[PDB]
Design a protein around this ligand. Sequence first.
Ligand SMILES: [K+]
Ligand SMILES: [K+]
Ligand SMILES: [K+]
Ligand SMILES: [K+]
Ligand SMILES: [K+]
Ligand SMILES: [Mg+2]
Ligand SMILES: [Mg+2]
Ligand SMILES: [Mg+2]
Ligand SMILES: [Mg+2]
Ligand SMILES: [Mg+2]
Ligand SMILES: [Mg+2]
Ligand SMILES: [Mg+2]
Ligand SMILES: [Mg+2]
Ligand SMILES: [Mg+2]
Ligand SMILES: [Mg+2]
Ligand SMILES: [Mg+2]
Ligand SMILES: [Mg+2]
Ligand SMILES: [Mg+2]
Ligand SMILES: [Mg+2]
Ligand SMILES: [Mg+2]
Ligand SMILES: [Mg+2]
Ligand SMILES: [Mg+2]
Ligand SMILES: [Mg+2]
Ligand SMILES: [Mg+2]
Ligand SMILES: [Mg+2]
Ligand SMILES: [Mg+2]
Ligand SMILES: [Mg+2]
Ligand SMILES: [Mg+2]
Ligand SMILES: [Mg+2]
Ligand SMILES: [Mg+2]
Ligand SMILES: [Mg+2]
Ligand SMILES: [Mg+2]
Ligand code: NA
Ligand code: NA
Ligand code: NA
Ligand code: NA
Ligand code: NA
Ligand code: NA
Ligand code: NA
Ligand code: NA
Lengths: 61, 140, 55, 179, 72
Amino acid sequence: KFGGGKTTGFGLIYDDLAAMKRIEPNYRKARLGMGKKKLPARKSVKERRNRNKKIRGKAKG
Amino acid sequence: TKTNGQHAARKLVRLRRKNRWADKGWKKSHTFVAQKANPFGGSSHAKGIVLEKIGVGAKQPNSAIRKCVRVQLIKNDKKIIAFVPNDGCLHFIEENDEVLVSGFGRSGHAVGDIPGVRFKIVKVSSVGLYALYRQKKEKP
Amino acid sequence: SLARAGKVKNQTPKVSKQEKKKQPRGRAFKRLKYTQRYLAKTLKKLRMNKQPPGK
Amino acid sequence: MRNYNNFNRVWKAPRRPFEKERLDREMKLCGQYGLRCKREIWRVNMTLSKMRRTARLLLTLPENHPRRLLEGSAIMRRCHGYGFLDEDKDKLDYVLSLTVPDILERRLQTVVFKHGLAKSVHHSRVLIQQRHIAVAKQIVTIPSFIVRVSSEHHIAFADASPFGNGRPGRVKRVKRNAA
Amino acid sequence: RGVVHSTKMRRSIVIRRNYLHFIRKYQRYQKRHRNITVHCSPCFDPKPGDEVVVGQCRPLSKTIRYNVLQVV
RNA sequence: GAUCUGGUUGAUUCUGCCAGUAGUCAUAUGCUUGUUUCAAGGACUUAGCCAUGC
RNA sequence: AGCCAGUGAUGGCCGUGUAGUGGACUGCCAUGGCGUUGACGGGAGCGGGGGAUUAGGGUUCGAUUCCGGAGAGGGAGCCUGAGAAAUAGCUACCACUUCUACGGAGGGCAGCAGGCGCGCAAAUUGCCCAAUGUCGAAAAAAUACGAUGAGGCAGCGAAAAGAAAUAGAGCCGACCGUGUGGUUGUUUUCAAUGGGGGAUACUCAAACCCAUUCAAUAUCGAGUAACAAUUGGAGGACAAGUCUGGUGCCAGCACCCGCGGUAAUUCCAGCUCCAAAAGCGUAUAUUAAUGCUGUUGCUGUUAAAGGGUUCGUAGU
Ligand SMILES: [K+]
Ligand SMILES: [K+]
Ligand SMILES: [K+]
Ligand SMILES: [K+]
Ligand SMILES: [K+]
Ligand SMILES: [Mg+2]
Ligand SMILES: [Mg+2]
Ligand SMILES: [Mg+2]
Ligand SMILES: [Mg+2]
Ligand SMILES: [Mg+2]
Ligand SMILES: [Mg+2]
Ligand SMILES: [Mg+2]
Ligand SMILES: [Mg+2]
Ligand SMILES: [Mg+2]
Ligand SMILES: [Mg+2]
Ligand SMILES: [Mg+2]
Ligand SMILES: [Mg+2]
Ligand SMILES: [Mg+2]
Ligand SMILES: [Mg+2]
Ligand SMILES: [Mg+2]
Ligand SMILES: [Mg+2]
Ligand SMILES: [Mg+2]
Ligand SMILES: [Mg+2]
Ligand SMILES: [Mg+2]
Ligand SMILES: [Mg+2]
Ligand SMILES: [Mg+2]
Ligand SMILES: [Mg+2]
Ligand SMILES: [Mg+2]
Ligand SMILES: [Mg+2]
Ligand SMILES: [Mg+2]
Ligand SMILES: [Mg+2]
Ligand SMILES: [Mg+2]
Ligand code: NA
Ligand code: NA
Ligand code: NA
Ligand code: NA
Ligand code: NA
Ligand code: NA
Ligand code: NA
Ligand code: NA
């Protein structure tokens, strides 16, 4: 709050730790740790997919 | 004295249409003829190349040399005469220089005691003429 | 003849500006102007810029 | 580009830019109420124009018209709530008689000076801007804040300010550090 | 509804509708008209100047969309 | 804001225009620019031509 | 001022074609159809919801977020499909154009970013699918993570819009103009606050901005507050000098009237003063001023303007 000693937010309380891990988004988990590793940059995935458009069969066709 | 008929709407509409061509202000904006004779293609500014520096004598009651310039416009290759304002300010302009030209204040009408001039120089070499006069910038 | 261009401007003797204390800005400027015009004097028509007599 | 946030202007420049009579009158208001520029006066002019334009429309309408009964009571309630009109004037013909000084007295800058927390309108302006005034335990730092009648007896020093229950300010803090 | 205008074609007639159009700026009216070609059955025998009532139907020719229902 | 002012005469009263004045999410250019919120942004001319990546 | 008919123009009869009606199309028959209530031809132009200016009536703009239409260099043809005459589908020609071993093979930014040219004129070859949606064999998670330049976020950005700093309160001394109060100045004192610097941290997909704080045992900072306001003006319209130098119908100013030839209220400067101000000038277009387009609401003896006179149709 402007010029004050108050704060307001949103909160959730889950019944079990297993339920929390199943439903919570990855970014909110990663703030606490216990998050999945970061995937490669989207640009690299885009270039590899476009290169593969000319190959057939094995060799990532 | 006009109709005043209650079923004479067609007569009143036709009367206004014919008589609206009799004022120069309405006709000029609706005729597309002044636009073609205008050296600017309906724009507010234009760019050109300097061909010559000339002196234009003032009209009869006054007496002076007005220090104008002759410019060929890039967009359509038309030749105009433009006034160069302020004291000195002719030493900042050389032949074959690139200038930006604007109008005077009267929409194609000549102003002041300068005989047939309706344009003035605003920028030279893309620096700004008034800025050069006040020494805020140097000519590139 | 374009020989005489900038004649008077180059002829004018050069006089430098004098340095003075800065004026207040913003609300403090309007306060200064109001005090000069309606305070500091007790009228019973005021001239804003009256000059000493001259030739 | 597909953005649908609205905006509008709140002031208008006068016609006739140089009238000696209007210039003299406006300078009196600026020095009396400690305003920054003429834009603050012209902003008040626009709101008064909108209020009076609406009232003129309703007074042309006949009595017990459905629009007059709803909108008329709404504008009267607004004027009474902000203190522009007293409670004994309730005819909707008194809205037409509002003036510029009637609204300039309801600004927080003027109200603080009237209550006695400041020595002048210029002192009161810098007190508000420097986070020293609270209206309902809420810090207000806008001099153009329009005070309601229900809030007029709750204005006091903020609890977080050195003039209230706060820590000492900059001069004391720097002096203590230098010691 | 309309007024019979011409009965030259075979099993077809032309009717004319007259109406008044309002011009807002002058607060006055002006006269207009519109011609429509319709199909007429042999059970009716209209003549120019008569009044007819027509009803919309499916396209019957290049310009015909109405049929004569009653002659008054 | 349901508002006008300067220019024709030795002076006067008119018709009539030229000039002044205010706005524009209306474009461009000049000088200047401490803080914060909200925003349009190669339409105008050339439905002109396109390296590269997606 | 007339338009339409060989080769369909208006209508009729039996058919063909279409998903279906129909001169849409084949054959035969009649002479019709439209027009001064402006057809036919020409010019400008994507239509609307709406924007600007608001006494009222009006004038003007609308390429551009929503809805509808059309196009993918030009123009034609087509396959597959429930739906395309599709273009990051195919076929050919025209104009441009790329690689080659010279046999041949390719291209379509009016998608995003970017480049050249054009012009008075318009931004990053950025980050992300966290939100809003679409497609789909698809909830999320677990041996086990769809795509998405649509979209969002940040960078650039004085188009435009809102809020708002550049100081506040006193003592002393010398002065001001009314007549113990109102205020200007220089030596002073004494509190406050941001612009800035940072964080146990907050925000956020991550980063940024905003907001909170300068001890909770334990957190930097204003005095010439150099942390220094600008752009236009001072003869009239139009607020503000009968000030002081220079120039001398020159240089220049001036939207208009006008100023300048030795005492310039107008030029070039200094000092003062005015307007409005984080903004302010200039150009072009447009609305109001404009009862100078007049329906509300103009004028026509002499200022511009009643036909030479009668008859007379459409119209009123
Ligand atoms: K048939
Ligand atoms: K299908
Ligand atoms: K998504
Ligand atoms: K002299
Ligand atoms: K007249
Ligand atoms: Mg604080
Ligand atoms: Mg005389
Ligand atoms: Mg077009
Ligand atoms: Mg449109
Ligand atoms: Mg266009
Ligand atoms: Mg736009
Ligand atoms: Mg666009
Ligand atoms: Mg298409
Ligand atoms: Mg192209
Ligand atoms: Mg195609
Ligand atoms: Mg493409
Ligand atoms: Mg592009
Ligand atoms: Mg799954
Ligand atoms: Mg998967
Ligand atoms: Mg986009
Ligand atoms: Mg702003
Ligand atoms: Mg500053
Ligand atoms: Mg700070
Ligand atoms: Mg001067
Ligand atoms: Mg003057
Ligand atoms: Mg004056
Ligand atoms: Mg002007
Ligand atoms: Mg002198
Ligand atoms: Mg107008
Ligand atoms: Mg009027
Ligand atoms: Mg006459
Ligand atoms: Mg006669
Ligand atoms: Na005369
Ligand atoms: Na800040
Ligand atoms: Na900041
Ligand atoms: Na249009
Ligand atoms: Na569409
Ligand atoms: Na093609
Ligand atoms: Na621009
Ligand atoms: Na008018």
